[PDB]
Amino acid sequence: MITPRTLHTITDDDWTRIALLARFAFGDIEPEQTQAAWRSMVPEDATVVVPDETDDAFVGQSLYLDMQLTVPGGEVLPVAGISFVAVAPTHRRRGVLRAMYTELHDRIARAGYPLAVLTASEGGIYGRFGYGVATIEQHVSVDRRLAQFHPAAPDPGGVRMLVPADHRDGLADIYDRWRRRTPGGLVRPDALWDDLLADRPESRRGGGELFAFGHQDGYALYRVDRGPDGRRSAHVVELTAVTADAHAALWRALLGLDLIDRVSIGTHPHDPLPYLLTDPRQAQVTASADDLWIRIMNVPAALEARRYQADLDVVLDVADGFRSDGGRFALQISGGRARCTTTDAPADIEIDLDVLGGLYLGAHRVDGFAAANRLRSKDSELLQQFGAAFAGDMPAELGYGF
Amino acid sequence: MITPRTLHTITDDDWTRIALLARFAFGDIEPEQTQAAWRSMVPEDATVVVPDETDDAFVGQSLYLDMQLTVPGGEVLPVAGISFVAVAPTHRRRGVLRAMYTELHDRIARAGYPLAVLTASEGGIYGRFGYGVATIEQHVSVDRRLAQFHPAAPDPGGVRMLVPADHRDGLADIYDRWRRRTPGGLVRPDALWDDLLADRPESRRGGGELFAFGHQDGYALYRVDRGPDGRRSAHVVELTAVTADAHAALWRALLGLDLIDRVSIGTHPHDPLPYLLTDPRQAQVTASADDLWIRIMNVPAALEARRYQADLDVVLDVADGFRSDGGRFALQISGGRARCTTTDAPADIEIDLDVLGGLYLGAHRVDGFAAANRLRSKDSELLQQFGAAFAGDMPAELGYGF
Amino acid sequence: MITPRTLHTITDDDWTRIALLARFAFGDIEPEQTQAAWRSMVPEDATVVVPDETDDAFVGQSLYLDMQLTVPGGEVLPVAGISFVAVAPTHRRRGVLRAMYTELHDRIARAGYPLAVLTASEGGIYGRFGYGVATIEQHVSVDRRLAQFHPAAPDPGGVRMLVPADHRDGLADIYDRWRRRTPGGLVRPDALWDDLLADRPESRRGGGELFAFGHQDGYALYRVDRGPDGRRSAHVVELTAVTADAHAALWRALLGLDLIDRVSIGTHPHDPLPYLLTDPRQAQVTASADDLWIRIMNVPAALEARRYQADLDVVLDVADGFRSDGGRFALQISGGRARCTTTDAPADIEIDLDVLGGLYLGAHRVDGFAAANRLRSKDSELLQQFGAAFAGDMPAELGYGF
Amino acid sequence: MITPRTLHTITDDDWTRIALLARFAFGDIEPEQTQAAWRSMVPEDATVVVPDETDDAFVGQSLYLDMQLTVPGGEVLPVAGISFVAVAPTHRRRGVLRAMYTELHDRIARAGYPLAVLTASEGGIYGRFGYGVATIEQHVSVDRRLAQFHPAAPDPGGVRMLVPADHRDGLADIYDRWRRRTPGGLVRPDALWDDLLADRPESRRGGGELFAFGHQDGYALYRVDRGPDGRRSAHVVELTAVTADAHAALWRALLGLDLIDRVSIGTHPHDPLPYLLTDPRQAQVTASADDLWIRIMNVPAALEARRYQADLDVVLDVADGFRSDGGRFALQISGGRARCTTTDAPADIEIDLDVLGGLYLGAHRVDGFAAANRLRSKDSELLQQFGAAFAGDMPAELGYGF
């Protein structure tokens, strides 16, 4: 009783049927405008579902969004943004997920995309299907009362107080400038902008209505919120800056607010904030989570489209235990650019598709993977070269979650 | 108007004074015998104090340890380790601290040391003097019952259950082989060993009673504790491993304790553990914090000491605002080795000595300091090269605190 | 080089700038018709703001409300209620505050107000400007199920349960009766009652709709809420009694609710609630925090207005390091009343202006101040006599906060 | 059934009976040396027990310690400190406690004591027996990191660190100088001093070993304590200060412990500590609670021993539902000194014996009692004159627990 039919387009009864299943698997009723916004991002032939005994509702679902992701060196690639994946609580353990994934990857594949990307949702299983953790989110916390900036620290001022809803075109532009300069940057449709700034109480979790700071080269969205204390603290929801001074002047404004005791952000790994303060201990790094996951769908494409931090000439055997996207490729990186030729010479390096996925925005070291035999070579030193080559120019940051 | 006094040698009465201040200053301190080992490690003319208006106990105290740190590429350097620094709460008011630091650091240079090192005390100002954070601890924490090793991951066995005090010599040179390999490695006199494996109730601190896992190329000391819940959790006091075989093996043993709920450790930034499991989410990285602070006491000595990761030719002006260990240097790095001579040439890159110290073990990135003007160049990729070169290839781990 | 600017009258696109600033600066934006009411209370030429270089929103703002304060002895003085003072977290450190406070106080002075009053908010630098804490607020928690009145203790009854809104006038009259009897007493404009009984969800925390109790001489507003447990307790929001029996009878009421585990109230220091029980231990006193602060603007005006508890023939040297309302005064107090007149004699007692302020409503002892050398006299008993004089019969208590 | 007998002295076998019953009723068995300390204090014919059927153990116990309370004006009286009151939880609800108290209070009365005193515990019924709350213990905490002393504030200097053990005499001497100035000052026998510095761990509340700060005119005693999250608060157990400076100097000391995030203390109502800080808000009053309770045994003797702050000539009717120590009394106060003789004329103020005991150290304001009818007079300004007379120059602080 398992066959998946790929929706050519998402009718209003299909979406209703999907927002039912999705509601069970993900929690709240993301509001009408938020999902419509999401629905608008779905290329056609991009929704694989599995119906029930009587085709009244769905008992499995998936889809990818049509996205454009920046990779190191600056190129944008179109990526397939896998999401709204759910199998009914009732039908699990009967292999619905796998069936539906194969069909969605053959659709993702035929539709052209070089990379597939997701965020991890609880209970998901991703490694064996070839997805690796590509970016890291690091929650960092500053007690504003004791933080005090370093002498050398920039102090560019020129930060306006903003109503975010009134500067859609303004913000969205700042974001775009950063997007083009930062790996992990997704393009964000006017749809989502419209929907973010709206400040739906629903999507709202973690504070009240939305405050915003503005700079010619950056902006910051944050919410205030009280604890059991009475004592409030600020949570930064997005802080996007395109110049160092943007970034600095914003952090300066943020620790400006006398109302609040702490400010926390969910940032990327090497954020400059601590180095801005006289003493790094004043900023308090308190978690490191996975953010963006990545299945490389077409090796040569993906590997050539990005730039490299060291030079390397090697044959690379990619294991793929789900599809046939691997094989042996000849990686040849010359002045930080690659030419990734299909081969059947012997290999220098064996790598599982999920770990090629992960290295890819330069967020990892071969150290963990190698020591875990997901990254093999008779030649210890070459494997260090490989990692250096794949290391990132700039710290990856996913633009937004999906 | 206050002059400090260098003690040619620390007497029983001195030490009593020193112990008394350091108790008020650091909290009811180590046992008598731990104190005895630290004392053991203080060379001559290495103690600076500000005597009380009449000498009973001191108003100000500082000394340094004779130590031996490992730098990248395995060279070992003698380093001065600034410990038991403290100003009696009754004189934190009047500039005692700078007085001692000036004298103590004078002493440290008269003695030859290329580096001064310390771990941070609450209340200490540090970069002012040229100490920068040079290594990092991530607090990783795995939920045993849900963790799961990767199918790929090595399962070498080789683990012996241990009573720790009973293989003091064995453990001790596993740790040496490690020390010799890892940047950050402090030598560890047997005085310190016998103190730790003595496993004293006061110096137990956070948990129950040391357990040990032994292995031909690694050990793991841990303590179990249970809190209000009724449920236990292991905390790893130290895990030293020389092979990735030792490490996997040790970690397999660790996540084998049915007794245990979570297993916490305090380790370096790019630890194999999460890569060893099927889903990097099973391991939960929580907090990242400073470990080891460095002040470079002799730029050419220390710069020539380690090895590097790109080539580099640059003239470096190094800004010290405490002593005069500053100045313009030719930094010439090829094939890893560096030649660093003093010069009158115009500088390509300015750098503040406290950030030169931080970068010294390969720990950070340039982006942060650059962003804050603690590191400048009109050429923006000269910087990117400089950084690229100072980077490490073994994550730096401070050997123990002091 | 900043010149501030007085708004002779508040515009609509003036009130817009002010709310926006205020929202950035005090957490939430209180409901519209809350703002409407306050703004209703701002007299002419009583708003001081600082425009941006652009002059689009405000980067500094402050204003006073014209009010009506009761002092020891029942006299009622007009008082500048300093409110909404706020500085954009962007132009911080630019000392706009001194620029504004200095104009806003010239205004207050021109207007002829004897006192200025405020409630404190985070970051507020207040003593520095001659403000002093003038009333104290004790929080109290009775656990109903073990509480029980004393045998001797009044049981008048006469408490109706009310719906708050419907007896707006009735409430208002009762309040007013209290006000004229109780130093601390602010007049409450009808605008404000309306907004109070209105009970909009947005400035309710913590609890639900607003329950109430009505005695001929007293009333009690409160909210109930489920906490974590989730067991319920009642926050008394405001309880006003003119006679001991309304006090008794209302407390009786409050403690007879059943949902309730405990009843909590913020109230003044010598509240007879605990004296009303068989054991004061039933009535847990939780905190003691600042409420109303006072800056004496016209020393003679203000001193003369109230009346006193001891006699006193002393020469006062009020010290003011912000403005110039200092000087030496012959303060002679005979049987209640004081004639304070400016003079040239040397001093007996010297006294910082912020101290005179806090001492004004009686709720301090001179001991603390004297110890700090904020209250200096060479004559030891003179000081203790000053205290004697400035004490008061009715415990001071602010009417409501702003 | 119940017939209490009054031990002439305590024999070693009698003490074990009491230590037995005490453990059941109080939990920790105070170390041997503690118990001896108290035994030391128990005078002749001062122990009252009820034995059980076999006459092997006791099923009800009580005694009083011979003590020395300091009352207003600085005169010391001998007071009977009721201690160690127990009833076997087996024989509770049989009237054991009233029986025991009645005889204990003749012993006290016939002994010649004008005051019984105790620190309340458990349940703890105390009102009816004539005991009222006499002194108050307000808990204060200071976030050390944020607190600043007011510029005006003494910085007297003069504080040393100590091993408090090695300074018992000079400590006790300072304590003595304080005890004779402060109402509530108990005399502290060497035995007790010896037991406090004994620092035994099974009587150690609020931290680890004892720290000391000594001044010639005061000392602070505190423990340090580490929270779940590894940050230390330091809790003062005793801060005895004989002059203003010593008080300033010691706080100035305490707040200078970089180790410590907050300091806390259980102190008296009007301590100067918040007044010493530039903003009183950095100090936080966090509880207010009963300390010492008092029963007046002999009204005339007691009222004559203390001094007063006003004058009055009144007939005082003292209620008493447990003994007949009440009566009507001519109370005339002038010069702050009172003569009090029995009189048969008719009364102006009728007073419960609770509230005379409670009002005795000048703690309370009479408004509370009067509202609750435990204090009564027609003439409403007579109550007011009574209270005014009964207030106290020095804030009262119990010397130590018992």
Ligand SMILES: NC[C@@H]1O[C@H](O[C@H]2[C@@H](O)[C@H](O[C@@H]3[C@@H](O)[C@H](N)C[C@H](N)[C@H]3O[C@H]3O[C@H](CO)[C@@H](O)[C@H](O)[C@H]3N)O[C@@H]2CO)[C@H](N)[C@@H](O)[C@@H]1O
């Ligand atoms: N594949 C899992 C996905 O889970 C989704 O649910 C959400 C979450 O799972 C995901 O949360 C990500 C988290 O994975 C991730 N490890 C870290 C990240 N901080 C979170 O994202 C969060 O931060 C960014 C703000 O910059 C926002 O874009 C996002 O709304 C917010 N929830 O962001 C998704 C969108 O808010 C979808 N319900 C589902 O379509 C999809 O399948």
Ligand SMILES: NC[C@@H]1O[C@H](O[C@H]2[C@@H](O)[C@H](O[C@@H]3[C@@H](O)[C@H](N)C[C@H](N)[C@H]3O[C@H]3O[C@H](CO)[C@@H](O)[C@H](O)[C@H]3N)O[C@@H]2CO)[C@H](N)[C@@H](O)[C@@H]1O
């Ligand atoms: N100069 C500053 C120093 O502060 C010191 O303070 C002690 C602690 O602050 C320091 O603790 C460090 C901590 O700062 C640091 N941020 C991280 C580190 N993990 C802790 O160290 C801890 O872990 C290591 C191994 O992990 C152990 O060997 C060590 O005993 C343990 N305390 O280790 C020191 C000794 O435990 C000393 N009191 C003193 O010698 C010295 O003045």
Ligand SMILES: NC[C@@H]1O[C@H](O[C@H]2[C@@H](O)[C@H](O[C@@H]3[C@@H](O)[C@H](N)C[C@H](N)[C@H]3O[C@H]3O[C@H](CO)[C@@H](O)[C@H](O)[C@H]3N)O[C@@H]2CO)[C@H](N)[C@@H](O)[C@@H]1O
């Ligand atoms: N300068 C502080 C001013 O506070 C205002 O904001 C609020 C707070 O400052 C103020 O809070 C005060 C608090 O300061 C104060 N130290 C103690 C008091 N418990 C609180 O007030 C609270 O209690 C009283 C009744 O008990 C209520 O009337 C009041 O609405 C309530 N918020 O009550 C105001 C709410 O009406 C104004 N936005 C602004 O003028 C400025 O922030």
Ligand SMILES: NC[C@@H]1O[C@H](O[C@H]2[C@@H](O)[C@H](O[C@@H]3[C@@H](O)[C@H](N)C[C@H](N)[C@H]3O[C@H]3O[C@H](CO)[C@@H](O)[C@H](O)[C@H]3N)O[C@@H]2CO)[C@H](N)[C@@H](O)[C@@H]1O
């Ligand atoms: N309640 C009756 C008494 O309780 C005693 O037990 C102890 C406690 O009751 C009493 O604790 C009191 C507390 O009741 C009291 N109402 C408030 C006070 N904070 C506590 O006292 C505490 O702080 C004081 C300093 O103020 C310290 O001297 C003392 O170590 C500490 N116990 O201090 C007593 C001894 O430390 C006796 N076992 C008993 O003889 C006696 O009947």
